[PDB]
Amino acid sequence: DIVLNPLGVPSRMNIGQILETHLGMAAKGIGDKINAMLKQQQEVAKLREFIQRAYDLGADVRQKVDLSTFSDEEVMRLAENLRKGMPIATPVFDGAKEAEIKELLKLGDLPTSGQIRLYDGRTGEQFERPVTVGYMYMLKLNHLVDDKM
C-alpha cells in the first residue's frame, strides 16, 4: 500500500519505526489468520485455543488476562472486531524486546528476520535483497496543497 525510503533511516535514527513495522506485520498476520479461520467457518473451540495461544505466549509481560470468564458468547464479536488486525499494546520504556517480537512473530507463519520475498508488478522479476515489509501508522497533517494555491 505504501513505499517509503529506507535511506533516511540511518540519518533520522528511527529504529523504533523498524520495530513498529515488524510488530505491525505480525499483528496483521495474526489478524489475517483469524480472518481466514472466520471465512473457513471453524468451530468455537478451535478458534478459542488459537486466541488463548495468541494472548499467553510470550515473555514475562505479567498480563494475567484469560478466558473462561465468558463462554459460548461474545467470541464471534471480538473475532469480527480483531479480524482487521491485532491491537498489540507496546509500552514505551518497559515494553517489547526483540525476543518477544520474534516469539510472537513465529506464531504468524512469517520469517524471523522479516525479509519476506517479494515480486515485481511492473517487470515481474523476483527481487533480490528480500524486502522487510510490514505495517506503519501514518498520519495526514493540517497543510494542504490546494489551500496553498
Partner 1 sequence: MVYSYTEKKRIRKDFGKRPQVLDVPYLLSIQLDSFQKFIEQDPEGQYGLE
Partner 2 sequence: SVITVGPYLRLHQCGLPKKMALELFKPFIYGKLELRGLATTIKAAKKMVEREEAVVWDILDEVIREHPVLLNRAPTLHRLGIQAFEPVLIEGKAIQLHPLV
Partner 3 sequence: TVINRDGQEEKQVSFNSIYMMADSGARGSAAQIRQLAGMRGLMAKPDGSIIETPITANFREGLNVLQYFISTHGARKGLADTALKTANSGYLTRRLVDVA
The listed partner (partner 2, partner 3, partner 1, none) that binds 61, CB under 5 to 8 Å by sort, is: partner 1
Query: How distant, in Å, are the alpha carbons of 11, 23, 57, 108 from that of 60?
Result: 34, 18, 10, 20
Picking from 54, 131, 126, 117, the residue whose alpha carbon sits closest to that of residue 87 is 54
Question: Binding string to partner 1 for residues 16 to 55, with x set by CB under 8 A, is what?
Answer: --------------------------------------xx
Question: 65 vs 149, which CB is nearer to partner 2?
Answer: 149
Cell of 101: 517480537
Stretch that binds partner 3, among 9-17, 24-32, 43-51, 102-110 (CB under 8 A): 9-17
Task: State phi, psi for 106 to the nearest 5 degrees.
Answer: -70, -25
CB of 119 to partner 3, least distance (A): 20
Question: 93 vs 119, which CB is nearer to partner 3?
Answer: 93
Residue whose C-alpha cell is 517480537 = 101
Q: Binders of partner 2 among 89-148, rule CB under 8 A?
A: 145-146, 148
The listed partner (partner 2, partner 1, partner 3, none) that binds 148, CB under 5 to 8 Å by sort, is: partner 2
CB of 109 to partner 1, least distance (A): 18
Q: Read out DSSP for 26-48? A: HHHHHHHHHHHHHHTT--HHHHH
Q: Binders of partner 1 among 66-85, rule CB under 8 A?
A: 69-70, 74, 77-78, 81-82
13 lies in the site for partner 3, by CB under 8 A: yes
Q: 143: how many CB neighbours lie within 10 A of its CB?
A: 7
**Contact between 116 and 131 (Cβ < 8 Å):** yes
The half-sphere exposure of 65 on its side-chain side, counting CA atoms within 13 A, is 10
